[PDB]
């Protein structure tokens, strides 16, 4: 949680573009900061970007190969649509280890997201009957 990381997280949250771009540029050359830092509330850059729905920021982050984790599930849970399209074509969990993307999508009615997942091809287990 160095001051450069705090400044960079604030830049991502507010929505400044040039600042985050040059920060990702100058981060690699020196290794003085980490792009995968964690907020005191457990919110890396990708999570907050997804929450605010900044598609350009999201793509920029993706291009520089940031760790994904349950970002797909986080985007599904918050009904963001285009982010799902971006996130498909590419150990403190939050959801129980028994949730697959189609299941969590079905939990929250969303015709678009469900129709997008189904075409890729998934299946849901049929539990044993008693």
């Amino acid at each position: 949680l160095s001051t450069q990381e705090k400044s960079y997280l604030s830049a991502v949250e507010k929505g400044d573009y040039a600042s985050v771009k040059l920060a990702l540029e100058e981060a690699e050359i020196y290794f003085k900061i980490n792009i995968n830092c964690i907020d005191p509330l457990g919110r890396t850059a990708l999570l907050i970007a997804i929450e605010n729905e900044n598609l350009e920021i999201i793509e920029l982050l993706l291009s520089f190969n940031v760790y994904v984790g349950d970002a797909l599930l986080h985007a599904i849970r918050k009904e963001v649509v285009g982010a799902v399209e971006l996130l498909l074509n590419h150990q403190f969990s939050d959801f129980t280890p028994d949730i697959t993307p189609i299941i969590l999508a079905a939990h929250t009615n969303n015709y678009e997201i469900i129709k997008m997942l189904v075409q890729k091809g998934v299946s849901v287990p049929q539990p044993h009957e008693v």
Binding site: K14, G15, N52, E53, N54
Partner: peptide, 22 residues
């Protein structure tokens, strides 16, 4: 969850315009 997005969009627009004019 709606107010936050609506505010940050304005903020980002402001940054873009201000930075692009200098």
């Amino acid at each position: 969850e709606n107010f936050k997005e609506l505010k940050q969009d304005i903020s980002s627009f402001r940054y873009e315009v201000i930075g692009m004019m200098k």
